[PDB]
From Swiss-Prot, chain B:
Organism: Saccharomyces cerevisiae (strain ATCC 204508 / S288c)
Other facts: Present with 32800 molecules/cell in log phase SD medium.
Name the UniProt record assigns to this protein: Heat shock protein 104
Record comment regarding domains: Has 2 AAA ATPase type nucleotide-binding domains (NBDs) per monomer, a low-affinity, high-turnover site (NBD1) and a high-affinity site (NBD2) with a 300-fold slower rate of hydrolysis. There is allosteric regulation between the 2 sites. ATP binding to NBD1 triggers binding of polypeptides and stimulates ATP hydrolysis at NBD2. Nucleotide binding to NBD2 is crucial for oligomerization.
Role played: Required, in concert with Hsp40 (YDJ1) and Hsp70 (SSA1) and small Hsps (HSP26), for the dissociation, resolubilization and refolding of aggregates of damaged proteins after heat or other environmental stresses. Extracts proteins from aggregates by unfolding and threading them in an ATP-dependent process through the axial channel of the protein hexamer, after which they can be refolded by components of the Hsp70/Hsp40 chaperone system. Substrate binding is ATP-dependent, and release of bound polypeptide is triggered by ATP hydrolysis.
Length: 80, 65
């Protein structure tokens, strides 16, 4: 993993990964990460920004797992 | 591979600082992973081809051929 791309993620230019922008990131990664490694690696993968649309699914996912992980159901929520 | 698949790999990947390994990675990432999926989906039961689609893609034997 790496957050080098955070310098570009924070451009906030769309939730999608942008062309050129992502390349500036990968370029910089090579500059700050031996390309020799990256010349063997299956691929560099870039994450989508978590737009509110993403959040609208994530929150439910996380609240559900978070609750499920709370020991035993002696209480828990109805979650309205 | 014809001239074209070979050219797609060369043209898409031939940076002068790359090493041949990225071409090899490219084909694995470009086609072979697609093949793996085609196999898993039974799009490829036996045999296989090469086809060039401009960008690139991989043909199937959709009848589980």
């Amino acid at each position: 993993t790496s957050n080098l791309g955070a310098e570009f993620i924070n451009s906030q230019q769309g939730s999608k990964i942008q062309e050129s922008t992502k390349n500036l990131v990968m370029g910089a990664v090579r500059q700050h990460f031996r390309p020799e490694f990256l010349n063997r690696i299956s691929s560099i993968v870039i994450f989508n920004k978590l737009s509110r649309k993403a959040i609208h699914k994530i929150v439910d996912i996380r609240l559900k797992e978070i609750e499920e992980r709370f020991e035993q159901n002696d209480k828990h929520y109805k979650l309205n | 591979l014809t001239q074209e698949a070979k050219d797609f790999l060369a043209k898409y990947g031939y940076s002068d600082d790359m090493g041949a390994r990225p071409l090899n990675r490219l084909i694995q990432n470009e086609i072979l992973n697609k093949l793996a999926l085609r196999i898993l989906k039974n799009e490829i039961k036996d045999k296989e081809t090469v086809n060039v689609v401009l960008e690139e893609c991989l043909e199937v034997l959709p009848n589980h051929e």
